[PDB]
Amino acid sequence: TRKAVIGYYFIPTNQINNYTETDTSVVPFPVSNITPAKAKQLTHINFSFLDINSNLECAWDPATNDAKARDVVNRLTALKAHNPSLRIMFSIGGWYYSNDLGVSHANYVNAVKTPASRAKFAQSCVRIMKDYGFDGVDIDWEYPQAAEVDGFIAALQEIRTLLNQQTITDGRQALPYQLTIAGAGGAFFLSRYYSKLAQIVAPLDYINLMTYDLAGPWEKVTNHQAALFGDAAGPTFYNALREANLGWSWEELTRAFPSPFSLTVDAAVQQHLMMEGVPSAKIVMGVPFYGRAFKGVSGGNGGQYSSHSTPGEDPYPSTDYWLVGCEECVRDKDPRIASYRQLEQMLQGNYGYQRLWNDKTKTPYLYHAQNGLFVTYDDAESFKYKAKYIKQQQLGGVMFWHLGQDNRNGDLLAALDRYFNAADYDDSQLDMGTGLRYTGVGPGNLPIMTAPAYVPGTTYAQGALVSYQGYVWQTKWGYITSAPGSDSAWLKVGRV
Amino acid sequence: TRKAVIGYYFIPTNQINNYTETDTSVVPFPVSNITPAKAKQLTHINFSFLDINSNLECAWDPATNDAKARDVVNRLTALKAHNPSLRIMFSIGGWYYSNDLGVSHANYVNAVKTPASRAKFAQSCVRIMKDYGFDGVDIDWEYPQAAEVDGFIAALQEIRTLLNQQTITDGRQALPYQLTIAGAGGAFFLSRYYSKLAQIVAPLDYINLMTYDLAGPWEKVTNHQAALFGDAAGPTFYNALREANLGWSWEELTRAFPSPFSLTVDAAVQQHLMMEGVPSAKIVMGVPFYGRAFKGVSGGNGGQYSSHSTPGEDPYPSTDYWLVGCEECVRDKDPRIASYRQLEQMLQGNYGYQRLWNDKTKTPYLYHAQNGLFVTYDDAESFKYKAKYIKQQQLGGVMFWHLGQDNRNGDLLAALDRYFNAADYDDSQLDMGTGLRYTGVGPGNLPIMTAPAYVPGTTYAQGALVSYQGYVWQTKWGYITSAPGSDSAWLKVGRVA
Numbered sequence A: 001t002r003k004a005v006i007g008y009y010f011i012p013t014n015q016i017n018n019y020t021e022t023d024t025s026v027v028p029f030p031v032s033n034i035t036p037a038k039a040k041q042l043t044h045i046n047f048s049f050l051d052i053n054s055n056l057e058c059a060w061d062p063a064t065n066d067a068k069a070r071d072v073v074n075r076l077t078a079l080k081a082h083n084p085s086l087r088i089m090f091s092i093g094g095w096y097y098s099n100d101l102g103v104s105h106a107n108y109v110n111a112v113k114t115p116a117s118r119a120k121f122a123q124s125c126v127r128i129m130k131d132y133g134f135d136g137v138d139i140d141w142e143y144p145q146a147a148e149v150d151g152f153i154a155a156l157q158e159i160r161t162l163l164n165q166q167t168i169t170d171g172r173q174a175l176p177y178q179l180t181i182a183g184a185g186g187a188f189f190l191s192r193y194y195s196k197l198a199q200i201v202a203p204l205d206y207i208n209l210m211t212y213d214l215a216g217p218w219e220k221v222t223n224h225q226a227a228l229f230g231d232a233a234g235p236t237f238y239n240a241l242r243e244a245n246l247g248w249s250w251e252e253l254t255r256a257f258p259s260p261f262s263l264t265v266d267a268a269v270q271q272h273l274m275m276e277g278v279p280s281a282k283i284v285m286g287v288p289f290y291g292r293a294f295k296g297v298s299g300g301n302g303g304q305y306s307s308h309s310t311p312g313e314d315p316y317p318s319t320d321y322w323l324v325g326c327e328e329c330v331r332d333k334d335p336r337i338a339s340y341r342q343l344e345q346m347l348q349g350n351y352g353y354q355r356l357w358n359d360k361t362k363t364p365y366l367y368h369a370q371n372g373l374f375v376t377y378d379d380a381e382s383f384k385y386k387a388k389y390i391k392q393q394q395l396g397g398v399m400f401w402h403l404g405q406d407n408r409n410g411d412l413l414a415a416l417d418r419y420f421n422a423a424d425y426d427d428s429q430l431d432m433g434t435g436l437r438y439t440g441v442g443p444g445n446l447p448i449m450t451a452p453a454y455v456p457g458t459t460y461a462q463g464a465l466v467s468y469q470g471y472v473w474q475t476k477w478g479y480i481t482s483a484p485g486s487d488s489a490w491l492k493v494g495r496v
Numbered sequence B: 001t002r003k004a005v006i007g008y009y010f011i012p013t014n015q016i017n018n019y020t021e022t023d024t025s026v027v028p029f030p031v032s033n034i035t036p037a038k039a040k041q042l043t044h045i046n047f048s049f050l051d052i053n054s055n056l057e058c059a060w061d062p063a064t065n066d067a068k069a070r071d072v073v074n075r076l077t078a079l080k081a082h083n084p085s086l087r088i089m090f091s092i093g094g095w096y097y098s099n100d101l102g103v104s105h106a107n108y109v110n111a112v113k114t115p116a117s118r119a120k121f122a123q124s125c126v127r128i129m130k131d132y133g134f135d136g137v138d139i140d141w142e143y144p145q146a147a148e149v150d151g152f153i154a155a156l157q158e159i160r161t162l163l164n165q166q167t168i169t170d171g172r173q174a175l176p177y178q179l180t181i182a183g184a185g186g187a188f189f190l191s192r193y194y195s196k197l198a199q200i201v202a203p204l205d206y207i208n209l210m211t212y213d214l215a216g217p218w219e220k221v222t223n224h225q226a227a228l229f230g231d232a233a234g235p236t237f238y239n240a241l242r243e244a245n246l247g248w249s250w251e252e253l254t255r256a257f258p259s260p261f262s263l264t265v266d267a268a269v270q271q272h273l274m275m276e277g278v279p280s281a282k283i284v285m286g287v288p289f290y291g292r293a294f295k296g297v298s299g300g301n302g303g304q305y306s307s308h309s310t311p312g313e314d315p316y317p318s319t320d321y322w323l324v325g326c327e328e329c330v331r332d333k334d335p336r337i338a339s340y341r342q343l344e345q346m347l348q349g350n351y352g353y354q355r356l357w358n359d360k361t362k363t364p365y366l367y368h369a370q371n372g373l374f375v376t377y378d379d380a381e382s383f384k385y386k387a388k389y390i391k392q393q394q395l396g397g398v399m400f401w402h403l404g405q406d407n408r409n410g411d412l413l414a415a416l417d418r419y420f421n422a423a424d425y426d427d428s429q430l431d432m433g434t435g436l437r438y439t440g441v442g443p444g445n446l447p448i449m450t451a452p453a454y455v456p457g458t459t460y461a462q463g464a465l466v467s468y469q470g471y472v473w474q475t476k477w478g479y480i481t482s483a484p485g486s487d488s489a490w491l492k493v494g495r496v497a
């Protein structure tokens, strides 16, 4: 089955209100950049972002010119003429509106609080969808805290119910309306709802992992923001999932959540697969179409794993635009981020950037020896390893943030489509390397194993293996006289 | 309040049926050995053991001659004329009858299953108690598994209700009928019901901890079976409590249950004290009146912490009675265990054993350099430290297995009574040593802590401390913007005054 290629596409309200397809000075990446050929390379475009207003319903930012907005959305849905599998989804949330300290946080917390609020919200989601011509709903709340989870889940279940009814009502069996969420791609935020992953994922077509922003100026050591695998020389982190309210034993938690560990794209994926009821087909790996830059880094490793002097707060707490060659950073007043389009332009100019490659994390990085700068980003090469990983792990596809940051030629999007679908691309010999793999084991990814059936009345020594209730178990200490599941001396270690 | 001194008194069915007080080869330790002076040294005698039958009722083993049984029990209750505080309890269970593979295990499991089974079983306990003249009931089931614990708790609560009614009916308010249980003294078995300890202990007057058998030939390294404190040179074990169904986070389990740890008497007592709702006054520390022997031991360290060649299975598989001087072992056909009485005689018979002392564990041991023998046991000196620990930790008292293993003079019982009640015994200067203390901290025994109240809308750095809803909490990582209590970012580390 074809892999999903989901491109979030972010158009700030100012660009909607002053939309133009002929002045990259006002709208740097307008819809017209998405040619028929590019429309065919995508399976989904997630228009970003809608929000949740104080009436606790899905709605466009209050400052939005509703007519320009409907027009921008129409240009997107018009792309469907070139790709019958294409869906224009809309995404609600995003960091700005929904983070704990964000402008609309309260609205998310309250919208899912009651059966009544949940019903009114779910209904506004479907109404907005049908009114603007969207093909599905993506929820990007970063992130419901542990207490708000059961409500978040109920809300997704209600939306699912309404969308399924609408699909039938609209004769959309061929292209059913969909419901997805953008999920954490790092253990710290994932720990908030991890214990209920199966319930969160059940009503979704996909869970889009934000497997990026895994490094940034808010961290003391420079690092790759989307390493596929770990580099023993890089920083390691506390495994937050061992603290999730999972109700597992010390032994179970320790083998599922090694700590510290390498914060990588593979870690996030494996962490989701470890849970029962989280099918690999619904997991979508996110990739960044932008890089993060750090200043004041020292040398010796190309800028990797170095202390730095980059402000970590938002907004950028200064007027010093130190990312040499980044004119976009001047336009957006933040030298800590740059689109792949801009990065390429910086490389093409002589600004002193050396493009380096880490063969463990399988990602590129830039090093500016003169001014001590380090930029972590992704490109068509790192996408080869991620695309192969998606195939090997049988994931649903790839997602990216965000379309408008690709170069004019659409090279990043083209690469992604090529790796999954081109008849003349062959990655059979691509070597995944020796970077660190996340090795945790959980209920959802137990190894197939065989062992003698447990025999009631038998005494087992430490380390013995038996099969019982369709699982393979191992005793944690000796002289075990009770059965697996009824005696905590037994550890589930395999399946079948 | 007087410290309890609870002596289990084990007399096998065969000894009951052939009971005599003039033939030590038939009944080694008759009730006649307990004089009025000795009776005053006890607060409880736990006659061992009655069982639960297939009818799911408390009963004597069917092979028991009933007249002979009443006669032995009368000799025990007659001891009450010499001590107005003394209670002759009866204990249901024991290892033989109640272990998972024991002969009557299914009866324990089934008896506690339903309101109806529990009522019937509980009424039979009171019936047996009144019929034979006992003063209370002790349950020694080794041990209920997780799924059976709720039934076990309800059964105990039912017995409690019936005993209290019986106390009123009998006008026994001066010496109320009591209910106790013998509980595990080591983490492996304790993990079966640990999570519900408070509910199990609530209906009880005391929980008698079996803080012995912590070492034995079934273990690859020789060790003290009842070390009070740990010895860094001795073996350590995985702390099974980390696998109990507690619902605690990895950090809480890790902090509460250090691992590996030293399996000691102090560790069991502290593990019980850690749980909220378990009063120290109900905890009774057990001590053994017997030792366990190992052979094939190496020298260099008195035979301590060495590999050995001792059969670990029961029954003893051969006829090689290699514990030199232990004639009791020949009679009972097992050289792996000997009563204190016998161990004292072995030392007396000049058979080549050296009495050594571990000043970390505060326990004695025998080492036979010639034959390569190691014996772990307790004596009047190790009891001095245990008695001071009981006073220090404010425990309910001491329990011992078992009375019939003391020497003829009753020196071990007398030592215990002395340490708690003798006006001329003063342990105020007794040095408890530098042995390893167990210091786990669980959300059940948090220290009083002080920290600024939690400020919503604040972003906390890793390690920050705040007070919130009755507790002090610490962040386990950075940029915490969530409130304490709910999510996994905060660790409960203290209680707010």
Ligand SMILES: CC(=O)N[C@H]1[C@H](O[C@H]2[C@H](O)[C@@H](NC(C)=O)C(=O)O[C@@H]2CO)O[C@H](CO)[C@@H](O)[C@@H]1O
Residues within 6 Å of the ligand: A008, A049, A093, A094, A095, A096, A097, A140, A182, A210, A213, A290, A337, A401
């Ligand atoms: C670097 C960048 O473009 N930052 C913009 C930020 O993007 C966030 C997304 O909001 C969030 N959601 C998804 C699906 O990616 C995410 O996980 O990471 C990206 C990149 O950090 O979004 C805000 C608005 O919410 C923009 O103002 C930022 O410029």
Ligand SMILES: CC(=O)N[C@H]1[C@H](O[C@H]2[C@H](O)[C@@H](NC(C)=O)C(=O)O[C@@H]2CO)O[C@H](CO)[C@@H](O)[C@@H]1O
Residues within 6 Å of the ligand: B008, B049, B093, B094, B095, B096, B097, B140, B182, B210, B213, B290, B337, B401
């Ligand atoms: C060494 C000894 O005396 N062994 C006898 C054994 O004693 C067990 C108790 O059954 C059990 N209960 C209590 C309150 O102590 C225990 O925890 O350990 C002691 C000592 O190991 O009891 C059985 C009968 O159940 C006898 O056959 C053993 O000889």
